[PDB]
Design a protein around this ligand. Structure first.
Ligand SMILES: [Mg+2]
Ligand SMILES: [Mg+2]
Ligand SMILES: [Mg+2]
Ligand SMILES: [Mg+2]
Ligand SMILES: [Mg+2]
Ligand SMILES: [Mg+2]
Ligand SMILES: [Mg+2]
Ligand SMILES: [Mg+2]
Ligand SMILES: [Mg+2]
Ligand SMILES: [Mg+2]
Ligand SMILES: [Mg+2]
Ligand SMILES: [Mg+2]
Ligand SMILES: [Mg+2]
Ligand SMILES: [Mg+2]
Ligand SMILES: [Mg+2]
Ligand SMILES: [Mg+2]
Ligand SMILES: [Mg+2]
Ligand SMILES: [Mg+2]
Ligand SMILES: [Mg+2]
Ligand SMILES: [Mg+2]
Ligand SMILES: [Mg+2]
Ligand SMILES: [Mg+2]
Ligand SMILES: [Mg+2]
Ligand SMILES: [Mg+2]
Ligand SMILES: [Mg+2]
Ligand SMILES: [Mg+2]
Ligand SMILES: [Mg+2]
Ligand SMILES: [Mg+2]
Ligand SMILES: [Mg+2]
Ligand SMILES: [Mg+2]
Ligand SMILES: [Mg+2]
Ligand SMILES: [Mg+2]
Ligand SMILES: [Mg+2]
Ligand SMILES: [Mg+2]
Ligand SMILES: [Mg+2]
Ligand SMILES: [Mg+2]
Ligand SMILES: [Mg+2]
Ligand SMILES: [Mg+2]
Ligand SMILES: [Mg+2]
Ligand SMILES: [Mg+2]
Ligand SMILES: [Mg+2]
Ligand SMILES: [Mg+2]
Ligand SMILES: [Mg+2]
Ligand SMILES: [Mg+2]
Ligand SMILES: [Mg+2]
Ligand SMILES: [Mg+2]
Ligand SMILES: [Zn+2]
Lengths: 61, 97, 83, 60, 23, 206, 127
RNA sequence: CAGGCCUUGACAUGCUAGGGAACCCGGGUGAAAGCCUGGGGUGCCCCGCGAGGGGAGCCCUAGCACAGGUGCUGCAUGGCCGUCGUCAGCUCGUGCCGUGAGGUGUUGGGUUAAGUCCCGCAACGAGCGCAACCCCCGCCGUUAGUUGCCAGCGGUUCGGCCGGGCACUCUAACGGGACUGCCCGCGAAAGCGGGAGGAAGGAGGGGACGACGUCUGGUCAGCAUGGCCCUUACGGCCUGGGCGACACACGUGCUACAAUGCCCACUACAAAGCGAUGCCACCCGGCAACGGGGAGCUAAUCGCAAAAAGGUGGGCCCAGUUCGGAUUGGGGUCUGCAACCCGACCCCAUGAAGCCGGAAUCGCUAGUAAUCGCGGAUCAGCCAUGCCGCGGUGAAUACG
């Protein structure tokens, strides 16, 4: 079997290929979003990473 | 030669089974009495309200009650007598040999 | 993916447009609503206008992208980001 | 979009996947019981008035 | 664990069979 | 809104089904559709005769239908004439042998669905809605009834502010199973909107 | 030559047959200690005969079906108790005071709509 | 939402006028829709050897009447629903009191889960509620004995398999059973405490059932309905897109952080349901999803079916691990016209966060909580970890 570095390289070439053509799958790898149809309104933390909290919308008084 | 009965009411189903059992009982020979087969129950569970009120429901069930009877010895006395008998609308009839 | 017991899928109404082109000497811009079609070796060198739901997106096709659907190269949503 | 929809429901569709049930009483797309061809709402209506043969309020 | 498809327990949880859970 | 249907609450106790047959999954629904399709046709045509109860009995490939009407003469027709044109148009609906029957209503002021349509008619006729209820309750009780309750809800008097009016006499135990409460609802239409009348007759307890 | 009791607990029904003998038992075509192997609660089934020193005296032939082994145990305990009082009703006392006569009617409560279980309510949050 | 289309329209019901009618086959263009098209044939009652000729099924076009609208108002409405709340309450009639609103009764003393009862009283009764009649579970009987059962016999390919039988189990319809009924004690009484019998004792456990009303509560998008509004379009058909977006924030959940655990093999014990372009025994091909075969069953018989936690044996040795299973590469399978956006599975590889969670906060009083698996409805398939149900195992604690 092909292993370690060589396998990693071959995995890398595959992702690289998707980006360069570049299919929707390739676009997702560009922005580091999920690739397999998961929702992104919530969760997706594994791909997106730690929460970058942001101000919300204020309420009236 | 056996007769199997089905219907949605147990009172009418049993009455007709009880009658058929009687019909052969007069005109010999032998009957294996009406046995109560297990009831198949179809349930429907529904949200009571028309809109959005999920946590309250109403349970509805539909019961197809079941009876089986055995006519041991045919004897065209009874084998005729049944074709000339009145059993209500609620019930359906299966006749085998 | 689509079971290979079945055939590789194209709409045929798009394939015939391509094949008629191959004869007479290509090319021509091809307007299609078949995102669902597979890209096929006879399509290389062409440019096929996939409709994303709003516009026909011109797509040039090469060998490196043969196994994919046409819709894969015409993204349906526009994002840019937030804030 | 209703009468055209409840009507188009009956039309034998171009593909058998495009077929779907309507409530034969009111034309509701959702929560329709194949056994009755009735939606969950209409089911409760007729059942309470005894117009569903042998169908009654469960309790256990 | 139950979320591991590559196990007996996992295939049970998902109610499916395969190499890891045969029938 | 809370209270359960008096009828559905008593099916198999003080109440029997309107449709009294058996069928299997393959054909419950077509049988159900025909029944409904039937009741519709009859409810509109036999309105004048005061349709109260439609009972449908079925065996195989033929169907009866028993109509309970307080003025049968409208149902039968001119020397057994109208029953034909309907049974003709009925079998045209069915494809079965429509054994249409007309059964008499002995006292029409003891039929809750009847009482309802009577009051609904009175209020389409712009009558005093409070008075109309009081009289309907009075007649029902006069007819030997153990209890009566009638309820009008909607734009009473055509007021912009919707309301609910109701009168009652005697006992009306909706919680009691062994109590025969005839229930009926009539929808009343007016220029200003739709009203709704519910009639409750406590015929008696077994 | 035989004494019978009908044993019931929690969906489990046991057909017990008490015959005199060395004191050997059988459940559903296989031996008792084979059947309830590794279940520490097993000894409770063979306990009404202790309240009346019949441990050695009776052998038992037992049929069991429905519920689970633990339920089947309580069921056998009922029937084996029932078989003894049929053997002699003088045993009714010294078995009834210990409750071997009665069948507990504790069964799985029905799950209710708007709940996760029978009584387990969905998690509350105001706002 | 974008684009391409239709105009008496996808649909109802009457009216003219023409083809002529039907209907099943196509064909060109096109993403389809649509537009343009080309086949064969209609009796009726009939004047009819006849040339013929029109009446009325339904089709088509033209032209009207009309249709259509998930467009708006839940601050015009019916209906149905949530809720306070299964809370112990809300009232009426006649009488009495007050100039009057209103009061009395419904307050009081005792009692109860209860306006449940008991005693008292200018009140005496009565209704809607409570309880009861209904259903499931627990004991027993009756009636039944196949497709269910097998105690004792006879065979026995060792499987209730066959004769045999319905005892038991069960199935499922009808009954019985509990009433503080009996004993003691305290009580004016109602009741309370206790005891015996008994499967069950103080409503035996659970369900169904929700008062007058409240919230201008919810729903004009399930339906109905007043009014307002649109009319080569705010109606209708189609192709594609979107409802599946993602710096973020909240709710309800699933799976875990491990050894009271994880894994492989072997071995048991449920219940409620579902099933004729359905469930699929078993055989063979595939590591497998599945595929080809192919019996049985219209199903207490045939099948979904293995229940799982458990039990037995061995492995792992405290490690971000044989814990966890996200994410990603690759290769396949199936439904489907079609899985790019956006399906579920299977297999190889990948093996993230997570070491028990800040302020805060939830559920449950017993076969409950916890934990374990099973089924169904919707449904081609399925994003179900949701919901409604079913059993298995089975606690802790309540001083107050
Ligand atoms: Mg997404
Ligand atoms: Mg919920
Ligand atoms: Mg070619
Ligand atoms: Mg509509
Ligand atoms: Mg569909
Ligand atoms: Mg549907
Ligand atoms: Mg693992
Ligand atoms: Mg009650
Ligand atoms: Mg006007
Ligand atoms: Mg049972
Ligand atoms: Mg449980
Ligand atoms: Mg508004
Ligand atoms: Mg409102
Ligand atoms: Mg309303
Ligand atoms: Mg609103
Ligand atoms: Mg105003
Ligand atoms: Mg008064
Ligand atoms: Mg004063
Ligand atoms: Mg005075
Ligand atoms: Mg007063
Ligand atoms: Mg009061
Ligand atoms: Mg008062
Ligand atoms: Mg007071
Ligand atoms: Mg209470
Ligand atoms: Mg008093
Ligand atoms: Mg009372
Ligand atoms: Mg018997
Ligand atoms: Mg409002
Ligand atoms: Mg509407
Ligand atoms: Mg409106
Ligand atoms: Mg569309
Ligand atoms: Mg959504
Ligand atoms: Mg979840
Ligand atoms: Mg299913
Ligand atoms: Mg790690
Ligand atoms: Mg870490
Ligand atoms: Mg690991
Ligand atoms: Mg992949
Ligand atoms: Mg997809
Ligand atoms: Mg550690
Ligand atoms: Mg833990
Ligand atoms: Mg409690
Ligand atoms: Mg666990
Ligand atoms: Mg499940
Ligand atoms: Mg499904
Ligand atoms: Mg998904
Ligand atoms: Zn409906």
């Amino acid at each position: 079997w092909k292993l370690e570095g060589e396998l990693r390289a071959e995995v890398a070439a595959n992702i690289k290929r998707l980006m360069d053509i570049g299919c929707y799958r390739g676009l997702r790898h560009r922005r580091g979003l999920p690739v397999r149809g998961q929702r992104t309104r919530t969760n997706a933390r594994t791909r997106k990473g730690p929460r970058k909290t942001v101000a919300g919308k204020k309420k009236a008084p | 030669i056996r007769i199997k009965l089905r219907g949605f009411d147990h009172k009418t189903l049993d009455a007709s089974a009880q009658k058929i059992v009687e019909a052969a009982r007069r005109s010999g020979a032998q009957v294996s009495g009406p046995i109560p087969l297990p009831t198949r129950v179809r349930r429907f569970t529904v949200i009571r309200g028309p809109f959005k009120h999920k946590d309250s429901r109403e349970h509805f069930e539909l019961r197809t009650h079941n009876r089986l009877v055995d006519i041991i010895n045919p004897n065209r006395k009874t084998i005729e007598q049944l074709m000339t008998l009145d059993l209500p609308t609620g019930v359906e009839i299966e006749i085998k040999t | 993916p689509r079971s290979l017991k079945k055939g590789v899928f194209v709409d045929d109404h798009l394939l015939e447009k391509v094949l008629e082109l191959n004869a007479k000497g290509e090319k021509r811009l091809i307007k299609t609503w078949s995102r669902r079609s597979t890209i096929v070796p006879e399509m290389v060198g062409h440019t096929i206008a996939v409709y994303n739901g709003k516009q026909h997106v011109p797509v040039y096709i090469t060998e490196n992208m043969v196994g994919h659907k046409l819709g894969e190269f015409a993204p349906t949503r526009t994002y840019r980001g937030h804030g | 979009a209703r009468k055209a929809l409840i009507e188009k429901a009956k039309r034998t569709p171009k593909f058998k996947v495009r077929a779907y049930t309507r409530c034969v009483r009111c034309g509701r797309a959702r929560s329709v019981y194949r056994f009755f061809g009735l939606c969950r709402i209409c089911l409760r209506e007729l059942a309470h008035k005894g117009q569903l043969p042998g169908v009654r309020k469960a309790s256990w | 664990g139950k979320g591991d498809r590559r196990t007996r327990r996992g295939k049970i949880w998902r109610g499916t069979y395969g190499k890891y859970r045969p029938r | 809104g809370n209270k359960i249907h008096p009828i559905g609450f008593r099916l198999g106790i003080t109440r029997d089904w309107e449709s009294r047959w058996y069928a299997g999954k393959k054909q419950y629904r077509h049988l159900l559709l025909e029944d409904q399709r039937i009741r519709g046709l009859l409810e509109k045509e036999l309105y004048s005769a005061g349709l109260a109860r439609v009972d449908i009995e079925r065996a195989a490939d033929n169907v009866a239908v028993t109509v309970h009407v307080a003025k049968p003469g409208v149902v039968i027709g001119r020397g057994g004439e109208r029953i034909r044109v309907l049974r003709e148009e009925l079998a045209k609906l069915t494809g079965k042998n429509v054994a249409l029957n007309v059964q008499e209503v002995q006292n029409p002021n003891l039929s809750a669905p009847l009482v309802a349509q009577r009051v609904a008619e009175q209020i389409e006729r712009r009558f005093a809605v409070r008075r109309a209820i009081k009289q309907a309750v009075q007649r029902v009780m006069e007819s030997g009834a153990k209890g009566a309750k009638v309820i009008v809800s909607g734009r009473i008097g055509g007021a912009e502010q919707a309301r609910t009016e109701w009168a009652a006499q005697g006992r009306v135990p909706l919680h009691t199973l062994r109590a025969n409460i005839d229930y009926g609802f009539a929808l009343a239409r007016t220029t200003y909107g739709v009203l709704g009348v519910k009639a409750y007759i406590f015929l008696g307890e077994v | 030559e035989q004494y019978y009791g009908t044993g019931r607990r929690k969906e489990a029904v046991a057909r017990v047959f008490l015959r005199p003998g060395n004191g050997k038992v059988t459940v559903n075509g296989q031996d008792f200690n084979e059947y309830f192997q590794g279940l520490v609660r097993a000894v409770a089934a063979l306990e009404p005969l202790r309240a009346v020193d019949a441990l050695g005296h009776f052998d038992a032939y037992i049929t069991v079906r429905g519920g689970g082994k633990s339920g089947q145990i309580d069921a056998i305990k009922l029937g084996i108790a029932r078989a003894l009082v049929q053997y002699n009703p003088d045993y009714r006392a010294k078995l009834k005071p210990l409750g071997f006569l009665t069948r507990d009617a504790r069964v799985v409560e029905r799950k209710k709509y708007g709940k996760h279980k029978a009584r387990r309510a969905p998690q509350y949050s105001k706002r």
